[PDB]
Amino acid sequence: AKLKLIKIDGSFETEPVKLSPGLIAKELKQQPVFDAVLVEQASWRQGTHSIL
RNA sequence: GGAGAUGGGGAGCUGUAGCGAAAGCGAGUUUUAAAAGAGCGUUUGUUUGUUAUUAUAGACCCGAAACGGGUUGAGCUAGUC
């Protein structure tokens, strides 16, 4: 695509960088995204609770 | 490795050829003298998520009389001294 470089001033550069098309997929998966976000929101749990 | 997602890690797991008690044979095979007949086979996978049911753990909850083991008690009462 037209990915373009930025300087520290905040003003862009004048020479954008093209991208290999293998990065951008024509087919999107929207169930594995959701599964991944849940599996990462879990695994962040200590689970130290206890009761007699 | 941020008490991380994940990366490495193919050792194993299931499926890919069944049949037979077994050696064995092999899209055939066991029984059988039989290459007939019949039985069984002649491809539809796997790993996770979630839910229902189920197994071993008290396993919906409450409820015994009891069983066993260790200790404490003869300052009432029974006996003896």
Curated annotation (Swiss-Prot):
Assembly with partners or alone: Part of the 50S ribosomal subunit.
GO molecular function: rRNA binding; structural constituent of ribosome
Keyword list, A-Z: Antibiotic resistance, Ribonucleoprotein, Ribosomal protein, RNA-binding, rRNA-binding
Recorded family membership: Belongs to the universal ribosomal protein uL4 family.
Gene Ontology BP annotations: response to antibiotic; translation
Superkingdom of origin organism: Bacteria
GO cellular component terms listed in the entry, alphabetical order: ribonucleoprotein complex; ribosome
Protein species of origin: Mycoplasma pneumoniae (strain ATCC 29342 / M129 / Subtype 1)
This protein's encoding gene: rplD
Name of the molecule in the record: Large ribosomal subunit protein uL4
Function field: One of the primary rRNA binding proteins, this protein initially binds near the 5'-end of the 23S rRNA. It is important during the early stages of 50S assembly. It makes multiple contacts with different domains of the 23S rRNA in the assembled 50S subunit and ribosome.
